[PDB]
């Protein structure tokens, strides 16, 4: 099963309550999910729904937690991966009522799914990024310790997404050792792809 | 566990004892059963004679998954002793251990020297004209063969043909400054003595 | 300590002029050095004082340097959002030394494959505004 | 050079401590506030010794006899 | 205590009267150490006592003021004064302030203040 | 002991509360939840000096306390958790005050005095090369 | 594959067949002995007299051979890609065999040198916990607050540091259910896979 | 399967691993080793000089010393936090696999420092901060240009805090008003008699 | 407000100043010293303290039960953790100090020693 | 619970039938919960016009001593029996005691939620992530070939300047090592519900 | 205490292939009581002349008087 | 600078749909001068003013910053340069339009690009005060005159962080250490006298 080996204890809590649940509810407590996931602060609009319902905040946060973690295990899959039917089936063990299955099916491969897999993607960074990098080209032709230098050097700035900035200035000797060693990473780069679709993809 | 410590290229999905009843032990004989073939096993099992347990014929099916494990343990290394090694040095320091981080530092400065004399370092410059854009791979290639870092064969001469050779690690001018000195700045420059004559 | 710092001084002065042999023989006869001493500064500036220059002329007057290069390539398998990737990562260190401090300061930059091909492509940039000056 | 904005005093005795039953010594203490560049006011305390106190009070007295035939 | 003699005599002394005690001649040789050694005692207890900033040293110049950058001509007279600062084992600040002759003279009057406090008080038993 | 028993099974009970209720993610936590689950913002203790009326205020003191001029006394905090604090430390010091020798005083502040008497009565490169050589 | 020695290397590594394969073991003694320990000019100079050549001549020589060394053990290149890259240079099979096996006496210790060079990020080093019961206040007096007091220790740069966190039991065991999921992840047959081809 | 000294829980698999190689020393130096590595859970240092010398009966490499003295201190510091006996431990060090003769010793040593490691690991246990010492000066404040005649108390305090053994404790400086350390001393008073209602 | 109380100023004193605001302007302000008096004074001994590197402005304090820990199963140690905010520099710094039930008792028996010398002032 | 002469003078006064009537007093305590847990500071709290008669420093001392109150019996946890034997104290009749309990339980819970949102604490995490890579190379070493885990936490908590994410690094034996310290911790919460 | 200058051309820049502009740098060493600092300064060319023009103000009236 | 593609050129057709001529030539202007941040802000004026899309809005502002930092860098002189880089199948009057726009700029562009190069801290401002001292704590008289020289100093503000981007420093000179970088100074102006160096 795609909720791997043994069931999640707030999936199955989530699953026997189901049973007792307006599909109405069924269906805004899922935009709430789905938004979350998206990054949407909606802890005020979830208390506001609690009261309609007349949910206790007991159950809310078990019926939340279980919807959460089951789509969490799901979007996580890729379409080679989990598809409709197998879906569908696994879903059925857990004795979830066959129209709440629909809707939860229609959000794992419906319209919604692209943007998911957008903000999906956004988590794999760990190290910051560049986010700005400027330069400029000096020549210096008279220093304190040379009437004539002609020396040229780069200097450089950087900006990261870390929101940390930096500002240094590079030799030239420096400056080729740092051009062969992006040439060089990116060759690497090519020929680890190579290894993979030859060997992993099949 | 002999199974999956070999890793022979088969998609071994299967569940250890759990000391399980009937039911659960008769699937996994079945399991065991369809994977020692696909592993190669020159001896065959059954799956009644793994309830039955018969010692005697099960034996040589053991000395191929024993003989193959540790094997594979040889060239992958053992996971378990790293682990003990790990849990003492989170608290325990050998003598020999002491030594190497005093001497560390001294060590490693020894390396980056090397790298530094022996670094690549640009041996041909490449023509602006006839663009090597067509594809990324043949810009990073021909890049790398500015350092000397080389149809692979032909590939290489069509490309090193794009190229000048070189002499200089530095770029110092000739004193061609003034061509960009005069040439953008000189009316400023004119400008500014003329006006710090007047002022004084 | 002075004659240190006289001698440092003489070959100072030397380094910014760049000063030719026979000029610097006869300055210093000229501050009366005597003729031994004269000959023993000629000859020791002659091999040494050419790469002596060439050291100077490599000086930076900036708060930081770039000092150090490096890199790790890694292969992305999954996280806890997606499961069955297979994407390069590049992790790049740059050791900067910021000698106000005599202090080296690390920095660690991640690059997936379009944006270290982005990052090439400056470089390259840089690289034909430098090849345009010689 | 920063600024004086305003000056204050305390005269007090520290009379006992943890270490030292009677300690029993006066001092004065000193609050200066001043205004750097762009306005910024800041603060800065300090004690004196009463013979500390006498000494400063002295050279302020100096300060002003110079000023005057400067 | 910061014992007088009597007091440090009586104390030794009980010392002394007692089974182990001390001898008089040690008394006596601990009393020629304590006369030297209660000044510096004293002040080191007064040290440890104070987590405050106290003045290591005031430093003062006069200048004549005569021309900037815009003003052409200037005559008044400035005094720059520095004042050092620091807490007990650590490394001294240095605070720079200049005054004007009026601002001099405030200074002055408000540091005669504290010492009319000061006789008030003493003068108060009379 | 039986006061520690009752206290340890309190605690027991109190963890099996916690612990049967799932996490929930923070964007979906209801106030219950965030207070459980430590997404709530506590606030510090931070405490204002109240004025209160005095009964056996008399004269000029007596007319601005019977006025809309002295606010009703926890009023004058705007926040309730300062208002809270504020309230608290102020009974706090009169029970100080109110739990709790002339001439030993008197004593005390002459051996001061005669301190501060006998204290005051002691009154009673190239670029530096080449201005050492040829600028100095 | 092979090793592509540059033309000042293979000049510098000239040396090794103009004197004796002795000699040449205590190039290779030394070294090794700079790799472990770190190098010391002074000895330059005393080959230089001893061997009747330039200071530099030694030190070109045995840094040449260093970086021999070094490079062999960085690509962990065979026995058989070694021959085929050392044969460029045209020295008898005493030294070729020499050269072998001071390569691979030495590769695993400093291959364990150079895994030091990598850029260096923060790790774990330690955890410790502690089970605390919240029972009053300055504000309220009874109470019972369950919390998991943790101090987490990390390594960078070989400075450690620490960390005090703070978990109530529902998110503790949320931690535990993510990061054993973490584990699980190695034994999925995607994650075979590239362990085992990508080797 | 689940055991005492385990915590209630199943063997770890590096535990059981290394438990078989406690079985080649002689069960005459597995005790004397023992000795050592509880000598450091006391604090008393370790003697790898001694562990060295005596483990050179079975020819331990330095992977079987640094495993050996892990196990040692994995069982000796788990049976301890968990109050197991040597009876208890001994049976179940047995079911295992260790022999009852190595078994024995082992525990023999464990019954001898029992009481002592548990009053050192009370004293290890998780602390944030420690409270080293305090110091206090009272002043008394006659006048001021701000009223001309104080005449109040004040105080001063200095905490001396510790965040980690063998380092140099922090000292927190702060002046109070004589209102404000009146409500303090109180304060801690209130504290002080909850505390002594708990233990 | 602040000058006038601080002075110990007598009342004519304080009229004479007054001479030029308007009669309700000088009855008002007078009325404001008479009725306010006592408190401005404390605020200025609140600023006296102030003549100082660092000042305590707050305290908390929690009383705690560890009941394990990875060292020992059954620990059951009371802890109290006090919470300080000290004013330094025109900013307040949160501390923490935690203690066992023996570092309390140090703690109390030093303050108790204070509070004596306090209250032969006080 | 101690209440010092002037808190208990203020009540002995509001027991009185003269100064307060039973409005009054209903009045003036209903004013003493509103200003205690009304986040509008409401100067006015006190101007209700059944209240003018009543001298004004006397009634702002008794309804500043009748917050005080509520605010030490809210942090001692005190029940009725406690309550109702301080009434009968300060010589209250069956009536106002009746009264006091019932505006007290009304906002029993409202003062306790309040009086436990003071205080300080700890960092607390919220979440983690995780990121599995393989280590292929670096610039000084080929064939590296080893597992990394990436992990960050999340944490929530502003009582002290912080940064909300800690990042770190593990190996195989360092995660391995990691998750069975948590379960360690988890197997303790287990057992302490058996109390 | 010291002085440190560098007088150069900017050449290219990553916002303009060619831009020719002319720059002073110095850097200026401070003694501010036990310890120095390090100033930093970049001049354009017209800012150059403006500096060395009031320096030389400065050096007349600091050899004249009243 | 990077070469434009027909994704950006379609983003350029936005500006058909568009108000005014104005319009697109203030979106020119803007994304010019704009930073990322400053592109989130106008952004907004972007969708404000256009209602379009928010991705036309950003995908155009996009495409206009690539567009006119592409000519300002390589400083295309003359239209026909700059009608080169747009595609055969563009609108052939908003391309035209664009080319107008791109030639009243492209000067001011290099000007304002200029200006705000990467450097060290900028001197913003110099000022002096000449003194003689005439007595100090040490000796009753002096006759010693000094200058003062205060700068005020401008650094990046992305560099600055929680600092104030200018600050101000005081260095006081002796004669002496003045006469010094007086000749250091001087070597400079001798050298562009003659409009290159010695």
Redesign the interface.
């Known amino acids: 099963s795609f909720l791997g080996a043994q069931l999640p204890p707030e999936v199955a809590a989530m699953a026997r309550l189901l049973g007792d649940l307006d599909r109405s509810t069924f269906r805004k407590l899922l935009k709430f999910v789905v938004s979350s996931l998206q990054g949407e602060d909606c802890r005020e609009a979830v208390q506001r729904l609690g009261v309609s319902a007349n949910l206790p905040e007991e159950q809310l946060g078990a019926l939340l937690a279980g919807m959460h973690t089951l789509l969490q295990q799901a979007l996580r899959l890729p379409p080679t991966s989990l598809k409709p039917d197998t879906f569908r089936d696994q879903l059925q063990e857990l004795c979830i009522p066959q129209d709440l299955v629909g809707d939860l099916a229609s959000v794992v491969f419906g319209s919604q799914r692209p943007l998911l897999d957008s903000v999906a993607q956004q988590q794999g960074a760990w190290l910051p990024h560049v986010a700005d990098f400027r330069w400029r080209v000096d020549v210096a032709i008279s220093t304190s310790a040379l009437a004539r230098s002609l020396q040229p050097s780069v200097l450089m700035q950087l900006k990261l997404s870390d929101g940390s900035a930096y500002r240094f200035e590079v030799p030239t000797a420096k400056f080729q050792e740092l051009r062969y060693s992006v040439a060089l990473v990116l060759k690497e780069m090519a020929d680890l792809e190579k290894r993979c679709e030859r060997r992993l993809q099949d | 566990w002999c199974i999956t410590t070999c890793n022979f290229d088969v998609d071994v999905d299967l569940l250890f004892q759990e000391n399980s009843t009937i039911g659960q032990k008769i699937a996994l004989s079945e399991k065991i059963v369809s994977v020692l073939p696909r592993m190669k096993c020159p001896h065959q099992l059954e799956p009644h004679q793994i309830q039955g347990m018969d010692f005697i014929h099960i034996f040589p099916v053991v000395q191929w998954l024993v003989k193959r494990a540790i094997e594979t343990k040889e060239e992958m290394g053992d996971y378990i002793r790293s682990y003990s090694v790990s849990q003492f040095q989170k608290t325990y320091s050998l003598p020999e251990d002491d030594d190497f981080i005093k001497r560390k530092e001294k060590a490693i400065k020894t390396v980056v020297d090397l790298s530094e004399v022996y670094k690549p370092r640009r041996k041909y410059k490449r023509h602006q004209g006839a663009e090597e854009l067509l594809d990324e791979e043949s810009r990073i290639h021909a890049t790398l063969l500015e350092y000397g870092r080389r149809a692979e064969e032909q590939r290489i001469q069509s490309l090193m043909t794009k190229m000048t050779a070189m002499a200089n690690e530095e770029s110092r001018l000739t004193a061609s400054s003034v061509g960009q000195i005069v040439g953008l700045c000189s009316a400023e420059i004119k400008q500014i003595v003329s006006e710090y004559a007047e002022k004084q | 300590h002075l004659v240190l710092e006289t001698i440092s001084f003489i070959l100072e002065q030397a380094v910014y002029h760049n000063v030719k042999p026979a000029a610097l023989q006869q300055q210093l006869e000229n501050i009366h050095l005597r003729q031994d001493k004269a000959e023993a500064f000629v000859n020791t500036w002659s091999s040494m004082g050419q790469e002596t220059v060439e050291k100077f002329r490599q000086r930076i007057l900036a708060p930081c340097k770039l000092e150090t290069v490096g890199w790790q390539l890694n292969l992305q398998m999954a996280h806890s959002a997606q499961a069955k990737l297979k994407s390069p990562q590049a992790v790049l260190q740059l050791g900067v030394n910021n000698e106000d401090s005599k202090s080296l300061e690390k920095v660690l930059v991640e690059f997936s494959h379009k944006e270290l091909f982005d990052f090439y492509n400056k470089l390259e940039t840089i690289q034909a505004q430098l090849d345009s000056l010689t | 050079t920063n600024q004086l904005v305003d000056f204050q005093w305390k005269l007090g005795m520290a009379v006992s401590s943890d270490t030292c039953r009677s300690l029993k010594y006066p001092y004065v203490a000193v609050m200066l506030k001043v205004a750097d560049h762009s306005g910024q006011v800041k603060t800065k305390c300090f004690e004196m010794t009463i013979p500390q106190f006498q000494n400063f009070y002295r050279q302020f007295k100096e300060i002003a006899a110079v000023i005057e035939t400067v | 205590a910061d014992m007088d003699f009597n007091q440090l005599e009586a104390f030794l002394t009980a010392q002394t009267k007692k089974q182990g005690g001390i001898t008089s001649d040690q008394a006596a040789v601990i009393s020629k150490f304590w006369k030297s050694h209660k000044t510096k005692i004293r002040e080191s207890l007064m040290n440890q006592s104070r987590w405050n900033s106290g003045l290591r040293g005031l430093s003062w110049r006069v200048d004549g003021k005569s021309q900037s950058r815009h003003s052409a001509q200037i005559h008044t007279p400035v005094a720059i004064i520095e004042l050092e600062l620091g807490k007990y084992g650590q490394e001294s600040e240095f605070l720079c302030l200049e005054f004007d002759e009026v601002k001099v003279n405030q200074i002055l009057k408000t540091l005669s203040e504290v010492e009319e406090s000061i006789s008030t008080l003493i003068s108060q038993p009379n | 002991a039986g006061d520690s028993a009752i206290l340890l099974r309190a605690i027991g009970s109190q963890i099996r509360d916690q612990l049967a209720l799932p996490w929930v993610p923070p964007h979906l936590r209801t106030p219950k939840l965030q207070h459980l689950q430590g997404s709530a913002l506590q606030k510090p203790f931070h405490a204002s000096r109240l004025v209160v009326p005095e009964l056996s205020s008399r004269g000029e003191p007596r007319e601005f306390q019977a006025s809309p001029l002295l606010l009703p006394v926890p009023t004058q905090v705007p926040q309730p958790v300062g208002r809270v604090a504020s309230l608290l430390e102020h009974h706090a010091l009169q029970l100080c005050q109110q739990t709790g020798t002339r001439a030993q005083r008197q004593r005390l502040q002459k051996q001061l005095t005669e301190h501060l008497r006998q204290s005051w009565g002691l009154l009673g490169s190239r670029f530096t090369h080449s201005e050492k050589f040829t600028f100095h | 594959m092979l090793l592509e020695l540059s033309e000042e290397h293979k000049e510098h590594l000239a040396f090794l067949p103009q004197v004796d394969s002795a000699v040449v073991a205590e190039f290779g003694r030394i070294a090794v002995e700079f790799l472990r320990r770190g190098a010391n000019p002074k000895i330059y100079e005393g080959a230089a007299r001893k061997l009747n050549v330039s200071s530099d001549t030694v030190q070109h020589g045995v840094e040449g051979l260093t970086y021999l060394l070094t490079e062999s053990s960085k690509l962990m290149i065979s026995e058989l890609d070694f021959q085929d890259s050392v044969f460029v240079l045209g020295f008898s099979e005493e030294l070729n065999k020499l050269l072998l096996q001071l390569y691979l006496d030495n590769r695993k210790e400093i291959r364990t040198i150079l895994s030091e060079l990598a850029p260096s990020l923060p790790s774990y080093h330690n955890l410790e916990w502690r089970l605390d019961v919240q029972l009053a206040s300055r504000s309220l007096r009874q109470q019972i607050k369950p919390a998991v007091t943790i101090k987490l220790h990390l390594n960078q740069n070989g400075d450690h540091n620490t960390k005090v966190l703070q978990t109530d039991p529902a998110t503790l065991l949320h931690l535990v259910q993510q990061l054993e999921q973490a584990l699980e992840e190695m034994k999925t047959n995607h994650c075979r896979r590239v362990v085992r081809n990508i080797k | 399967m689940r055991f005492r000294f385990c915590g209630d829980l199943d063997c770890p698999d590096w535990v059981l691993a290394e438990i078989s190689t406690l079985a080649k020393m002689s069960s005459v130096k597995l005790r004397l080793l023992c000795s050592q590595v509880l000598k450091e859970l006391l604090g008393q240092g370790i003697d790898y000089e001694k562990i060295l010398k005596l483990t050179a009966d079975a020819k331990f490499e330095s992977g079987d010393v640094k495993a050996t003295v892990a196990v040692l201190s994995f069982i000796l510091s788990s049976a301890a936090k968990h109050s197991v006996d040597g009876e208890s431990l001994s049976s179940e060090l047995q079911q295992l696999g260790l022999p009852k003769e190595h078994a024995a010793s082992l525990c023999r040593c464990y019954e001898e420092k029992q009481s002592p490691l548990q009053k050192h690991l009370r004293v290890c246990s998780l602390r944030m901060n420690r409270l080293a010492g305090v110091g206090w000066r009272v002043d008394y404040t006659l006048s001021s240009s701000l009223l001309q005649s104080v005449e109040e108390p004040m105080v001063h305090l200095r905490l001396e805090v510790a965040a980690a053994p063998g380092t140099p404790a922090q000292p927190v400086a702060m002046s109070l008003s004589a209102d404000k350390f009146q409500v303090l001393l109180a304060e801690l008073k209130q504290a002080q008699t909850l505390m002594s209602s708990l233990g | 407000f602040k000058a006038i109380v601080g002075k110990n100023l007598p009342d004519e004193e304080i009229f004479q100043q007054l001479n030029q605001l308007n009669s309700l302007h000088q009855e008002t302000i007078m009325k404001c010293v008479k009725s306010r008096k006592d408190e401005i004074k404390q605020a200025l001994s609140r600023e006296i303290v102030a003549i100082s590197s660092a000042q305590l402005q707050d305290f908390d304090w929690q009383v705690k039960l560890a009941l394990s820990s990875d060292k020992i199963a059954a620990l059951r140690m009371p802890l109290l953790s006090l919470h300080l905010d000290v004013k330094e520099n025109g900013e307040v710094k949160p501390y923490s100090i935690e203690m066992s039930r023996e570092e309390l008792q140090n703690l109390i028996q030093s303050l108790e020693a204070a509070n004596k010398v306090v209250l032969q002032l006080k | 619970m101690?209440?010092?002469?002037?808190?208990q003078?203020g009540f002995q006064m509001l027991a009185d039938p003269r100064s307060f009537d039973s409005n009054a007093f209903t009045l003036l305590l209903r004013?003493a919960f509103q200003?205690?847990?009304?986040?509008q500071?409401?100067?006015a709290?006190?101007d209700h016009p059944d209240l003018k008669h009543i001298?004004?420093?006397?009634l702002?001392?008794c309804?500043?001593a009748a917050?005080?109150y509520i605010?030490?019996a809210?942090?001692?946890?005190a029940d009725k029996s406690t309550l109702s034997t301080y009434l009968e104290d300060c010589k209250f009749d069956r009536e106002r005691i009746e009264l006091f309990c019932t505006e007290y339980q009304n906002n029993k819970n409202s003062l306790?939620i309040?009086?436990?949102?003071?205080?300080?604490?700890?960092?607390?995490?919220?979440?983690?992530?995780?990121?599995?890579?393989?280590?292929?190379?670096?610039?000084?070493?080929?064939?590296?070939?080893r597992?990394?885990?990436?992990?960050?936490?999340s944490?929530?908590?502003?009582?002290?300047p912080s940064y909300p994410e800690?990042?770190?690094?593990?190996?195989?034996?360092?995660?391995?090592?990691?998750?069975?310290?948590?379960?360690?911790?988890?197997?303790?919460?287990?057992?302490?519900?058996?109390? | 205490i010291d002085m440190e200058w560098k007088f150069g051309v900017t050449s290219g820049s990553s916002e303009l292939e060619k831009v020719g502009s002319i720059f002073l740098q110095l850097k200026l060493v401070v003694k501010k009581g036990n310890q120095t600092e390090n100033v930093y300064i970049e001049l354009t060319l017209p800012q150059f002349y403006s500096f060395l023009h009031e320096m030389e103000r400065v050096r007349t009236s600091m050899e004249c008087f009243c | 600078m990077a070469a434009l593609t027909a994704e950006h050129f379609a983003a350029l057709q936005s500006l058909l749909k568009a108000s005014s001529k104005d319009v697109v030539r203030q979106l020119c202007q803007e994304s010019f001068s704009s930073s990322a941040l400053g592109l989130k802000k106008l952004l907004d004026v972007t969708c404000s003013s256009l209602s379009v899309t928010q991705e036309e809005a950003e995908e155009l502002l996009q495409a206009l910053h690539r567009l006119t930092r592409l000519v300002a860098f390589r400083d295309l002189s003359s239209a026909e340069a700059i009608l080169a880089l747009f595609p055969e199948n563009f609108h052939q009057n908003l391309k035209n339009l664009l080319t107008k726009i791109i030639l009243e700029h492209v000067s001011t562009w290099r000007t304002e690009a200029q200006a705000n190069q990467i450097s060290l801290p900028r001197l913003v401002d110099l000022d002096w005060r000449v003194d003689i001292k005439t007595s100090s704590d040490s000796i009753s008289r002096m006759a010693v005159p000094t200058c003062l020289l205060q700068m005020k100093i401008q650094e990046d503000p992305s560099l600055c962080g929680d600092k104030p981007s200018i600050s101000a420093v005081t260095v006081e000179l002796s004669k002496e250490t003045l006469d010094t970088m007086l000749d250091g100074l001087g070597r400079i102006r001798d050298q562009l006298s003659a409009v290159a160096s010695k």
């Open positions: 101690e209440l010092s002469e002037s808190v003078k004013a200003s205690l847990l009304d986040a500071a409401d100067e709290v006190l001298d004004p420093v006397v702002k001392h309804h500043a917050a005080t605010l030490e809210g942090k001692h946890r306790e309040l009086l436990g949102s003071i205080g300080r604490s700890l960092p607390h995490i919220t979440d983690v992530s995780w990121r599995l890579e393989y280590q292929i190379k670096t610039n000084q070493l080929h064939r590296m070939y597992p990394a885990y990436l992990v960050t936490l944490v929530q908590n502003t009582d002290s800690i990042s770190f690094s593990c190996s195989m034996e360092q995660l391995q090592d990691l998750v069975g310290k948590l379960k360690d911790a988890s197997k303790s919460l287990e057992r302490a519900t058996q109390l």
